[PDB]
Write an enzyme that holds these catalytic residues in place. Structure first.
Site, PDB file in Angstrom:
ATOM      1  N   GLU B  25      41.515  21.662 -13.361  1.00 29.17           N
ATOM      2  CA  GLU B  25      41.188  20.595 -13.984  1.00 29.17           C
ATOM      3  C   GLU B  25      41.535  19.167 -13.558  1.00 29.17           C
ATOM      4  O   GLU B  25      42.839  19.125 -13.018  1.00 29.17           O
ATOM      5  CB  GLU B  25      41.294  20.314 -15.498  1.00 29.17           C
ATOM      6  N   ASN B 170      31.188  21.946 -21.374  1.00 22.14           N
ATOM      7  CA  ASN B 170      32.474  22.365 -21.602  1.00 22.14           C
ATOM      8  C   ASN B 170      32.779  21.829 -23.262  1.00 22.14           C
ATOM      9  O   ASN B 170      32.369  20.543 -23.711  1.00 22.14           O
ATOM     10  CB  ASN B 170      33.713  21.469 -20.845  1.00 22.14           C
ATOM     11  N   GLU B 171      33.311  22.681 -24.036  1.00 23.93           N
ATOM     12  CA  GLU B 171      33.688  22.247 -25.325  1.00 23.93           C
ATOM     13  C   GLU B 171      32.846  21.157 -26.215  1.00 23.93           C
ATOM     14  O   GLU B 171      33.079  20.433 -26.713  1.00 23.93           O
ATOM     15  CB  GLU B 171      35.499  21.741 -25.448  1.00 23.93           C
ATOM     16  N   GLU B 280      39.568  29.777 -20.757  1.00 19.79           N
ATOM     17  CA  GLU B 280      40.745  28.892 -20.820  1.00 19.79           C
ATOM     18  C   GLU B 280      41.681  29.858 -21.767  1.00 19.79           C
ATOM     19  O   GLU B 280      41.479  30.126 -22.794  1.00 19.79           O
ATOM     20  CB  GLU B 280      40.590  27.492 -21.418  1.00 19.79           C
ATOM     21  N   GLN B 325      46.437  26.157 -16.857  1.00 20.74           N
ATOM     22  CA  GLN B 325      45.694  25.943 -15.743  1.00 20.74           C
ATOM     23  C   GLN B 325      46.691  26.294 -14.638  1.00 20.74           C
ATOM     24  O   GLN B 325      47.675  26.642 -14.799  1.00 20.74           O
ATOM     25  CB  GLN B 325      45.342  24.471 -15.539  1.00 20.74           C
TER      26      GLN B 325
END
Ligand SMILES: O[C@@H]1[C@@H](O)[C@H](O)OC[C@H]1O
Ligand SMILES: O[C@@H]1[C@@H](O)[C@H](O)OC[C@H]1O
Ligand SMILES: O[C@@H]1[C@@H](O)[C@H](O)OC[C@H]1O
Ligand SMILES: O[C@@H]1[C@@H](O)[C@H](O)OC[C@H]1O
Ligand SMILES: O[C@@H]1[C@@H](O)[C@H](O)OC[C@H]1O
Ligand SMILES: O[C@@H]1[C@@H](O)[C@H](O)OC[C@H]1O
Ligand SMILES: O[C@@H]1[C@@H](O)[C@H](O)OC[C@H]1O
Lengths: 482, 481, 101
Positions: B25, B170-171, B280, B325
């Protein structure tokens, strides 16, 4: 290729005694002409068919569900109490018959006491009210001086009945149910009925309505997960093809795990330990009418053995199950005016309930598997199962630790299976193998020939390691002294 | 009470190569100062940190997710393309930094081609639009003469990138996310974006957002299950306690089974074969800020091996996973201006990825089990796990059939385990055992000591039945034949 | 609109083709004038916006000095087109329509 290994010293978990439960609805000849037939030469002074009673006592009923089923969603229990002559005749919208109410709450409870079963009463949420459900609960369970507790005593029973299992509605999702509800409606109502019924008697177990609609299940669990004890599941299966029927044991298995995972996902329900009540199940695919006299054959009884073995291995998730139904309507037993027939579905229970322990022990099975695509049920819904085993088993021990029971299903349609079996620490002894079997997958018992499909016994020699040849389409229990 | 039986002749199923995915990210030092650092003596002339590049190549990244994560929900991709000096500086709402956009779509794709990873792009559904997503897809994948395909050529790449994996938001459930949505909004929006993106390029795979709310997941599947290919799940865990951290592998497992069952309950999704993307996952409990420089210890790396072994066994249900990540932010690699550290979470990938087959074989494990209640994650959520094993394993074989790998995690904190192993029909041979562990469960690598926690090897001889002693808090791969 | 050689190629989602846009509003109106037909223009409510439809109307019907009325004159047509019929969306109920409602 095929094998079974058992260790009777590794207790996995207890086996809920209530997986072997049964169910009698006011449907066609289940009650009237089934368990109950006033004035028959075959009945006692209470109107109970004595031959049916003997067959029912033989399968050791742990709990018995009544009165419905679609029937209960337009049943007013007060219609069925007091002197019989004064009970009103009602029109049952479910099955479109004149219900005389001559079998009502007091007869049902007498029936349960006679056969040793815990009663399991479903309430009417279709045309019923909260007050009416509370009064039924007060009549059955009240110890004090409330009107309905007193009424039970006035009608000849001073001691409370202590009904422990209460069905909060029946299939309220289905358009066919009187007073059917949306998910939000039923979930609010389940919470309201359950919470106030438990204010009166906090000891009861409440079974709320589940189905295959996952949104429905979630709403119910979200709204009432803090007070209910079970969410229920109904499973009907079968087709003319042998494998298509019996492999649905393993479809059922995936349904149950699915519903268990829904419970895991709702915090109040998961923390409370809500479980599943499989409170209606059977083969049902040939008959669609007001009587449902499904002519079970051996194929269907092997399905039923598969479920009971599955329920022994999963009873921590499904501690309560009820075959639908006991007599005539989808009936394990089939009656006529001058006798009865024990179907292979009855024989499945006769085998397992009489040869099974209270605790499951470590059981490892090797089996070939198959994949299948089939149809099930009266509407022939397509389904598929992946990796169904040709052989399955569950080993259990008695409470005292003295007897071992190894239940074995050979699903193979044509080949017997010579299976090697190991039992840890087992001396060399003789044992007994009880086997449910018959000549072909379509075999039936009749009035003429009541034992075409039956349970055989045979002596064998066992040891830490032995073999046994299991007939195709059969279920066996190897009973060993320890 | 402990044992492992493997039959290399019995192939259970393939192991999807995409379980070993990663994620970068635009967050703190993941990109700027992590994989990319213009003007570092350690960077090549494209700005890619050479030392990081080398560490990343060694873990054979199958796919790499970018650019977020919360960042993508307010990211306009066109701000990141064309001559760098003309790219606008933007305020990133997610992490509150000025984003220069000097690392943009073309640099990310160069990065992927360099490391040999499939790119996996997440789109902006927070402030973004359908047209904007289609443009991104057109720029990347367009083979014809459309404006954005031609623009890709103009900026120096005539051949389409062929981005295969697209992240549909995303989310979007989280109030923290820019432009967050209700279940019903997001389910309809996922169906709209996916279907039209697939009209432009029907070979793409679409990952839709899922989470822990079963209603959310069910709405998404009911509405978009005819078009999506995965529903995603994010899983962060850990506490200071060793068993509390590593046991949550088995919490993850129950979670995955749950989502899997939700998919089974929606006919279109089940029939289409919609699967899970665990896009994730990591330990994450110590830090909560906009850099997320979590200091992984060996405990955390044992969790990571545990996950990788679990995915080998469950990749039919979860074929795609991305550690969150790659660098610095929740980083498997931690960079400083004058070098890097390879944390024990990196080492887990270094071990498994270099010592694993494409096909899972029959593997039966006897293990004692434990029950636990603990806390996890930054807000210390309570959890429980029942019957987590002290020992777990997965055996895999190479595609050609020449090589067997038996991965074994010993979760036991204090005791070595002497384990009898049987491998059907195997001769006597020499084999090599690669082992990842360290001096204690809290061991770390540092700049000064970069090998406290490392993979050591030992030659052993092996047969149809043999034994091996697995050190406590360790992961080992027995490589055979 | 504008010089044809500068018009962007688009991928049309409805019929899956590269649209060159070499036939656009000015060519459409010219074709209507040629055959003597009143133009009837449908607007884009799928990926379009209110501003975008107002700009199309301004461009076609604007009598004043607004940006889009001037833009119509800059490309060759000082007089407004006076489009009388406007279609407020197309088949917005159908799930086959982009941005259906
Ligand atoms: O009460 C009913 C009875 O009248 C009918 O004739 O057979 C069974 C019931 O459904
Ligand atoms: O159990 C249900 C039954 O009661 C109804 O009558 O028909 C459909 C079945 O699902
Ligand atoms: O419930 C599902 C069933 O309906 C389908 O036919 O196959 C997979 C099952 O798990
Ligand atoms: O994430 C970056 C941050 O680390 C830096 O300090 O500010 C600019 C950002 O793009
Ligand atoms: O941006 C520069 C960075 O790349 C380098 O490593 O250290 C000095 C800084 O000026
Ligand atoms: O993954 C989520 C993270 O992105 C957000 O900032 O905090 C809550 C987490 O669950
Ligand atoms: O999701 C659940 C988790 O939150 C809880 O701690 O224990 C059991 C799991 O199924």
């Amino acid at each position: 290729s095929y094998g079974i290994v058992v260790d009777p010293k590794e207790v996995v978990k207890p086996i809920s005694r209530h997986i072997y439960g049964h169910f009698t609805e006011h449907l066609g000849r289940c009650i009237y002409g089934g368990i109950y037939e006033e004035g028959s030469p075959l009945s006692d002074e209470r109107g109970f068919r004595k031959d049916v009673l003997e067959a029912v006592k033989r399968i050791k009923v742990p709990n018995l569900r009544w009165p419905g089923g679609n029937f209960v969603s337009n049943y007013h229990w007060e219609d069925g109490i007091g002197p019989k002559d004064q009970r009103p005749v009602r029109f049952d919208l479910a099955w479109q018959q004149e219900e005389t109410n001559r079998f009502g709450t007091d007869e049902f409870i007498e029936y349960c006491r006679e056969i040793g079963a815990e009663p399991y009463i479903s309430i009417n949420m279709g045309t019923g009210t909260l007050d009416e459900a509370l009064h039924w609960l007060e009549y059955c369970n009240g110890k004090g001086n409330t009107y309905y507790a007193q009424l039970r005593r006035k009608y000849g029973h001073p001691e409370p009945y202590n009904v422990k299992f209460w069905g909060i509605g029946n299939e309220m999702y289905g358009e066919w149910q009187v007073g059917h509800m949306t998910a939000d409606e039923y979930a609010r109502a389940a919470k309201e009925y359950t919470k106030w019924m438990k204010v009166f008697d906090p000891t009861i177990k409440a079974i709320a309505v589940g189905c295959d609609d996952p949104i429905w299940n979630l709403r119910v669990l979200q709204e009432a997960g803090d007070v209910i004890d079970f969410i229920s599941y109904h499973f009907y299966t079968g087709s003319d093809d042998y494998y298509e029927t019996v492999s649905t044991v393993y479809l059922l298995k995936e349904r149950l795990i699915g519903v268990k995972k829904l419970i895991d996902m709702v915090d109040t329900a998961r923390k409370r330990g809500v479980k599943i009540a499989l409170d209606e199940w059977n083969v049902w695919y040939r008959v669609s009418d007001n009587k449902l006299e499904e002519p079970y054959d051996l194929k269907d009884g092997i399905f039923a053995c598969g479920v009971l073995v599955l329920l022994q291995k999963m009873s921590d998730i499904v501690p309560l199950a009820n075959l639908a139904q006991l007599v005539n309507a989808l009936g394990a037993i089939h009656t006529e005016k001058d006798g009865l027939i024990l179907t292979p579905v009855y024989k499945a229970f006769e085998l397992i309930v009489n040869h099974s322990g209270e605790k499951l022990v470590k059981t490892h099975v090797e089996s070939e598997t198959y994949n299948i695509e089939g149809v099930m049920f009266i509407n022939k819904m397509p389904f598929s199962v992946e990796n169904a085993p040709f052989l399955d088993a569950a080993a259990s021990i008695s409470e005292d630790g003295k007897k071992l029971f190894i239940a074995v299903v050979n699903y193979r349609k044509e080949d017997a299976l010579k299976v090697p079996i190991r039992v840890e620490g087992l001396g060399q002894k003789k044992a007994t193998v009880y086997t449910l079997t018959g000549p072909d997958v379509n075999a039936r018992n009749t009035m003429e020939n009541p034992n075409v499909v039956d349970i055989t016994s045979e002596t064998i020699t066992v040891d830490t390691e032995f073999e046994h040849t299991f007939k195709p389409f059969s279920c066996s229990v190897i009973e060993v002294e320890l």
